[model samples]
Target: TAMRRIIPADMVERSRCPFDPPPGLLERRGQDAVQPLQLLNGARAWLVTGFEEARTVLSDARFSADRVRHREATSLQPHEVAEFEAGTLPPGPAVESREDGFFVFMDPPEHTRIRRLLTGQFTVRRMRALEDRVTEIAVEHIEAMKAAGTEADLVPAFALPLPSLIICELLGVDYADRAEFQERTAIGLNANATAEERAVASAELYAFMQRLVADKRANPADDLLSGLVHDADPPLTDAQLVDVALVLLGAGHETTANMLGLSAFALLENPDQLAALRADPDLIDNAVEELLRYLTIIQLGVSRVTTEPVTLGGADIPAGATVVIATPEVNRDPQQWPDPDRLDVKRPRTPHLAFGHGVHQCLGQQLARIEMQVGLRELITRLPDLRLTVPAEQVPLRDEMLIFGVHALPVAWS
Candidate 1:
């Protein structure tokens, strides 16, 4: 049955087309809610296209987040195997068991423990506390961009620095190190990079963060990393600390940075939707959520392996099967969102899994929300005439990376 039925996903997105999912993917969803997909590695996996089914599988403990547990059940090309062995990926810790280092890959009690520790810092209270500062950071970027007075690449000028600054300050990492770490992060996240390339980048970043952890241990500061070093009862070891910091540093800025550029691009493309927000500033929050759903920036969905046989959307998914939730497909599922293709800032917000669901949901979700809400609102209000400098077809998209976004969004305003 698996051999007879296989639909390969065309991971490539059309350049300059900001709002559409790959036409092939949309067509796959039209065929069935869940189906078998053959990856380049020749591994057979399930592609989930239904919103409810996708959410259902993501939260089910029967499906494990740990890639290690399901290693044998999947297939990998020579290149993929290289990336896995490269050690450039994300991790965790504790008296119970030493986590691989990123909570995202850990399961159960381990994930629960580390995740709970960071939860307090990202609470609604904490994010609200940072709201003013976030707004300030956004405005400063806008001012700097406007003052520069030439067509600016939004990726570097506005999108990148805003989130990088926030996350750097949050984790207490040096802002000066942004360019270096962000470059490694891009390399590590780039699917096209060889395992050797990714491994080199991963090692260098870990070394830099490892050194930072050492500094914090010697003389703690007020930042989150310092807190992790000096305050935790047992305190994380150098390696664990490096792992945690890497996760924050890598994820904290990358997603929001893409969101900033892509959402702006989306709005610029849809002037009517952009005008609606300008007409009613109160729509900023809803607009952000809608954009999150519409874009679902992460090209692939949250990946998980089945730990036990489970039925999803009428298909019996064998244990150990690699299941990928095609987020853009589910987010655009007509069954969930009516007339989903149109960008409607005024649309009432719904439960969007853009940040994902279940225990492993994004830890910095609220912070991202705050950054996007503030950054987008301030930009639109301050630069009402903002428009793209390049032709729509020329706006380059970052199709190579695991995260989907524009490479450089060049824009200007009168």
Candidate 2:
């Protein structure tokens, strides 16, 4: 049975969730094929929504992201494309994706080998090494919020700064230019901004990378970029060095920023969970997992194309079809997660897809998780009386956002 979509006419009246896609959609079956109706976008791509199907399609290597043939999604409107055009969208009117971007698009040994370079830096051990520094940054930001009094949107004040300070230090991005990076990164993520604004932000990032790489060449700092600049095993080419730095710097702040911003939103909404977190700070570790899963800020998964015919669960998908893994849907899948939709503070063992699954999972996860833990504990402690100042629904959300999150979250705590 095809899932019947609610009429566009009644969309607002039928608003199920502010972050969800248009209502109803093809129905979900019990552990079977996901979508009975795969709607074709105006660009003629199939949209897959079933939880099981999305999971199968993503991990299947048969879905090739080969740049040669399947390279023409240039059709996406301005707001519906990549943050860097290095993934799915082309830089020009004809969206021909380039391979010069982040490591998110690569597969197998190439992906594994390149990623292994930074794997050490992101492990729990490395993050723990920097724990004092991260904690100091967290405490400083919390004081800033205190100075602002109880009325604040900790998202920008404390939630956002924690990661940038840590990742920039880790990547050895000079403190001199961190402010510039933040400004430009904001422009890059702003969906309502003009294309020119996006281009300007991207250009700034590239130029920043070029200079950072050149600087590291002569006088390297004591950080990951410095190590990569001069590593012996599987030495990084100058070009690879630039791309990798871009990955760490761009992703470092963005992912953590989402976590910080969204965590505030989640805790504010689930008062009981908030109360529990306040009472037991030790639960912060597990709470971070719950927040990541419940947040679903990284709404869009890596765009995958089927390289060969593959069978998963039961559906046999043909080659050359492009699909989104739809991370939010899988995160909300009822089978794997009990009471999947609800936010649970005491869920002992959480195995959500927030960092994704298997080999290609997020490399920056360690730093991101630490940022969440710090913000969650600190925000709750400092703003003991905090509550949402704006109606949750009225909080501005990113529309058609690749990385879904809040625009601004204002709260008052006295």
Candidate 3:
């Protein structure tokens, strides 16, 4: 199939390159800075591709999501917009975003408040407590795959289900509804769906989450949601509850799933990394970190509304300009890393932006680390001879305007 090019303008001139940058271009973290090009829509956004530049920009306080429409900042295409509703944006000007794009927007006091409230609930200790259950879920999935046959799709069959079900358990949701939740959330994440699809999924997911909150209120379980609902002093409001749930629910297994599949891709592509992981065994943790660094799945960085005017990266970032720190680019920036392209599972200077950096760095980093460490270790150990069933470049890479992930990860194990 011939490659498609939706972008206009010379590749060398585009200020901010999209996640799937055009071929023949260096496509490194600083591609935008080196081959600078502006967005065609004239959103007037800066693609902070350099790692140091990205950190400076992301941490700077001059850009604001609240100031402009997020539609302009993100790469979500038309059909993708139809798959979402107003609620997914997290309440904002003129209209309240239904559902919770919690991790996406908000600043200061409000961002601080909501994040603080859920800290305890999402802490490492709590996630650790759920490890036994998570392990059981993973083991079960592997067994199911074994039952299916030697060749299997490790995505929906395992990678996807592990995080989804564990999250359902942690959130105290019905095991049966896990599929429905994944369907709604997955469609919302992908932009290929129609407006009708986005709207329906948004409505159904928000409605389901709302009802789940109500249930947790009445019958508090030994889960995070119940704890949130039953909190005293200042009670968790319906809106706040939804916001928290939406963040955890959507994010719960997203990056983790991507990590699981992509890590395998990395290992399959670079047997040395796989060998290092298999040899040391204890290095599993380090390998997990490296994989996140090596394969930064979340192509686009989070949005931060500038609270006040500030200057960064030798550029005058005026107030209200949307600053997007390209994660895929920054995580692989050569300046911050040595041999940035190499997958060194035990690299000495592994200061990568797998989760993110600074104040808004992934609060659930510990949980993700634990999952990936255990998840990858178990799979590698169990399927010692497992190898990819497809060609290296033949694997389907996500062509979605935003978020990058493998559609299917098929492998054969004896």
Candidate that scores best on lDDT: 1
lDDT of 3 by residue, 105-145 (tens): 65454456666767767766787787777778778888888
Q: Quick one: best TM-score, which candidate? A: 1
lDDT of 1: 0.76
lDDT of 2 by residue, 345-405 (tens): 7886657667765566677777677677876787788776888888888877653444656
Where is model 1 more than 4 Å wrong at Cα? Answer: 1-9, 72-75, 79-99, 175-202
Query: 2 or 3: which has the higher TM-score?
Result: 2
Tens-place lDDT digits, model 1, residues 1-414 = 121122243544555566777876866756768787666554567888889988987788888887644452233544454443343322212325544567777778778777876774565665766787798889998999889885688887888778877876777767688677667766754446897998998889778887888888888777777877777665567787788888887777778989999999999999999899998888888999999999898766477878788888768988667788888888888887899887888877788778888998888888898899999988888885899988888987776556778877888887
TM-score of each: 0.88, 0.83, 0.82
Q: Show pairs that collide, candidate 1.
A: 91-101, 91-102, 91-103, 92-101, 92-102
RMSD of each: 5.1, 5.9, 6.0
lDDT of 2 at 48: 45
